[PDB]
Amino acid sequence: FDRDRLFNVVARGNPEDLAGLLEYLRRTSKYLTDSEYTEGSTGKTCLMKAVLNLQDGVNACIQPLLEIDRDSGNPQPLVNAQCTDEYYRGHSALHIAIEKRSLQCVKLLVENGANVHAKACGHFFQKNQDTCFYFGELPLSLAACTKQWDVVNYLLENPHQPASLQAQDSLGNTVLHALVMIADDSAENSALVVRMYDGLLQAGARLCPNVQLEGIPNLEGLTPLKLAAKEGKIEIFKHILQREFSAPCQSLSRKFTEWCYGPVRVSLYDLASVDSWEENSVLEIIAFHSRSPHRHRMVVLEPLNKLLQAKWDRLIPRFCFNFLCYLVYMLIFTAVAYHQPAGNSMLLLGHILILLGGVYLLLGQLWYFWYSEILFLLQALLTVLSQVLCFLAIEWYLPLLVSSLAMGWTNLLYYTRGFQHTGIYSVMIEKVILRDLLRFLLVYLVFLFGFAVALVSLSRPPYRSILDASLELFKFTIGMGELAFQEQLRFRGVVLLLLLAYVLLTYVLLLNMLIALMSETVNSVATDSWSIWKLQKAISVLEMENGYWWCRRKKQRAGVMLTVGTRPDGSPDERWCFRVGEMNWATWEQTLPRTLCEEPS
Amino acid sequence: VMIEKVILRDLLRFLLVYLVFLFGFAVALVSLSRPPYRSILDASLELFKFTIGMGELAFQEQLRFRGVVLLLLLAYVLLTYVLLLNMLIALMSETVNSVATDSW
Amino acid sequence: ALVVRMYDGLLQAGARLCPNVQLEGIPNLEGLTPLKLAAKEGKIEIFKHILQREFSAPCQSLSRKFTEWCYGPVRVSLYDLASVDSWEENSVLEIIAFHSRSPHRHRMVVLEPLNKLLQAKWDRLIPRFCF
Amino acid sequence: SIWKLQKAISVLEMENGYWWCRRKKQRAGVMLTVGTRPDGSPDERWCFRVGEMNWATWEQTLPRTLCEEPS
Ligand SMILES: C=C(C)[C@]12C[C@@H](C)[C@@]34O[C@](Cc5ccccc5)(O[C@@H]1[C@@H]3C=C(COC(=O)Cc1ccc(O)c(OC)c1)C[C@]1(O)C(=O)C(C)=C[C@@H]41)O2
């Protein structure tokens, strides 16, 4: 009974042609799992091609083939056979039947004993590659990622071998982690993800009520909310963070109403993994651990904005204290640099005080690293280097001393971010330097030094060196340039023509730079620089909460310890919540919410 | 009306950041040149002449530290061009995103 | 809407009536087939339509776009590179670059099979550009 | 798109070779068998592969495929 005849029979779909197969299999002691019947290049079995070729609903050759497998005594059944390639490893026929959207074949395969925890862990099924599909590794994850709620409901609630929601793949991801990983912030994708997420949570409340599905961490240590915060998936992070359920599963909410009087109400938000009191929070991950381009859009969301504004309003005296200490330090730097040359003792005290302040700032910035932090690092490094060369009397200390003086007075613009009006202005300064200035300066220096070499070789004292002709040409861009008809020179008209062409080309280049900045500024969302400034302020408030480098600071927890309801296991659940008041003048059309308190307080 | 709105909004924060830039380079040039730059109050005037268009940059043969003075002047010219360009781009941001009936 | 519907109907009727002959292979007196005349003239809508074309089961051999496999949401599509690839003489790419006097040639470069084929050809030749 | 056309003209001139030494050029794509002709033969065509992701696939009808499983 040949292999190709077996594949042609199971692809055709007639069960009667599979006659005499079991009697042939009995005498030769060969099994359908054996390597003569697999492809060998991939390990593909005849049941897999029976499921790949289906009828209108379901092929009719599967169950007689599985009966023939049961008839002979096979220690390894055919329904649990996996692929063996490096590309497509661990894939089984239950995955194929779930992929083909076919519920009757899934019922049939589980009904004959298929493993519902087989992991499709080959290379095609891995995370970040070219032309792959990462859904998790499990059949329940494949059913949830492809919008098949009937297959999900069967795999959870079948009589024999139920699938576990707590089960997790090689990366430690459950089904909720995998639903975070497939989000792309499109409309249809988000509508799939939030609906399947809530359905899985409610089914876990029904099936396994004692376990918390969202507390389970991955192998990196992340829960679904922190993975959503790290990955930068805004649609599901916003949805999870303000979540309201109904009466039988109301303990799975993260948003509550404390009281409601007319149009005013007070809402409560759960601060479980959000508040920066605890280790490895959502705020620290948005600020410090996410490499997404849109972190500043995630700061602006609804519970986070008011929590950060409250944390900022407490820490304004510490911000003003740090500003005054840095400004006193720079006044001492200036008085020590201006008097370099009763007095010598004051100068010695000034030099030692500048060395201690430089070592202080350098240790603080290195403790940070273990745009603006780079500049504070460079100032501190050059200050310590200048004072170490001042101790040895190397006499080349004075350029480094005055260079670090200029950088310290410029680094004073870090503190402009305390106000909105100056903070957005300095955000724009950084964006003008790091984007628009450098390619201007590239094309300009290529234009400058070509004309410089041309004028030196043509004038051979107007232009003696390359380095002096480039200075005389730069004076044109300032406004101090000297163009005259040179009577002394042999080649007078050509020098005059080269100067006139230089002036025209640099006017064209400056005009292009200005027009490119208008192209960037007219085509822009106005909220974006505001939100970049908000993220600057959030990073500042988290570093001020962490404390200084020598003295760690004991930090208070935010919120209020408030009793929300009862757990399914007969206890009250007290949660730390953040209060946000609201006004709504269209309340009276909508239905009234359930409240914790009868009257305001 | 536009003259008042340009003075009371756009000019003062430009002038804040500009004076912080001006006097840092002034102190640096006086302490490095120790007669090109004798006092703080005269070096700040010589640096303000660059913003007008009358600034004098030359390779100072007399000074001990010649290349560093030249590099500090070139960096000053670049930073003030960046600041003026930012002021202009912020006024275009305020003027393109506005209702025309409001000044009326 | 007239041109693409009448074009497909004429192709299917040629499949029914004279199946051995290829209607789109016949050249003009300049040496251009319909796709190259569309590329030269700068007619974007019909050039885009011809370049990614899918028919149904009785005339499926007249397509220029195919599906190799499909698994859930991911799929791999196939595009015919008959007169497009610059390996052969007088291609669509050489005509858009060198023989068309249309003002909007740069809009025809951005279309869906052409953009990725040009990005692949650029990614191979970066060492020669740096050399 | 004007920059893209500049890049396309550059890549075609670099494929043509230098002026003294013409360059033997490779054909792009993959020689893949698509179906059968009306005159009882298979038609092999050179094709270019482009991958796609679509999260609204399940409302639409399924396409006809060349391969049963990915590769
Ligand atoms: C890291 C970069 C890109 C940088 C390092 C130094 C060399 C710098 O020259 C530049 C570019 C440059 C290159 C050559 C000639 C002139 C300018 O700009 C900054 C850099 C640009 C200036 C302007 O400073 C700012 O950007 C404003 C600012 C400072 C500190 C902040 O913490 C800050 O946060 C908002 C903003 C400061 C200098 O350190 C300075 O005062 C001196 C003497 C030169 C400046 O290079």
Author numbering:
A (entry chain A): 73 to 413, 427 to 455, 469 to 558, 586 to 726
B (entry chain D): 525 to 558, 586 to 655
C (entry chain B): 263 to 393
D (entry chain B): 656 to 726
Provide the authors' original text about this structure.
TRPV1-TRPV4 are non-selective cation channels which play important physiological roles in sensing noxious heat, maintaining cardiac structure and maintaining skin, hair and bone physiology. A distinctive feature of TRPV1 and TRPV2 is their permeability to large organic cations, such as the cationic dye YO-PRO-1 and the sodium channel blocker QX-314. The non-conducting structures of TRPV1 and TRPV2 possess two restrictions, one at the selectivity filter (SF) and second one at the intracellular mouth of the pore (termed the common gate). Our data shows that binding of RTx induces C2 symmetric conformations in TRPV2, but the extent of C2 symmetry depends on the environment in which the channel is reconstituted.
Classification of the TRPV2RTx-APOL sample revealed the presence of four classes: one low-resolution (~7 Å) class, which was excluded from further analysis, and three higher resolution classes which are representative of three different conformations. These include one C4 symmetric and two distinct C2 symmetric classes refined to 2.9 Å, 3.3 Å and 4.2 Å, respectively. Unexpectedly, the transmembrane domains (TM) of the three structures obtained from amphipol-reconstituted TRPV2, TRPV2RTx-APOL 1-3, show similarity to our previously solved cryo-EM structure of TRPV2 in its apo form (TRPV2APO) and adopt non-conducting conformations. While fully bound to RTx, the TM domains of TRPV2RTx-APOL 1 and TRPV2RTx-APOL 2 structures largely retain C4 symmetry. In order to determine the effect of RTx on the TRPV2RTx-APOL sample, we aligned TRPV2RTx-APOL 1 with TRPV2APO. The transmembrane helices S1-S6 of the two channels aligned remarkably well (Cα R.M.S.D = 0.86). However, RTx binding induces a 5° clockwise rotation of the ARD when viewed from the extracellular space and a ~ 10 Å lateral widening of the cytoplasmic assembly. In addition, RTx causes a conformational change in the S4-S5 linker, as well as a displacement of the TRP domain. The conformational change in the S4-S5 linker is caused by the introduction of a π-helical turn at the junction of the S4-S5 linker and the S5 helix in the TRPV2RTx-APOL 1 structure (S4-S5π-hinge), which is absent in TRPV2APO. Nevertheless, the RTx-induced conformational changes in the S4-S5 linker are not efficiently propagated to the TM in the TRPV2RTx-APOL structures, and they fail to open either of the two restrictions in the pore.
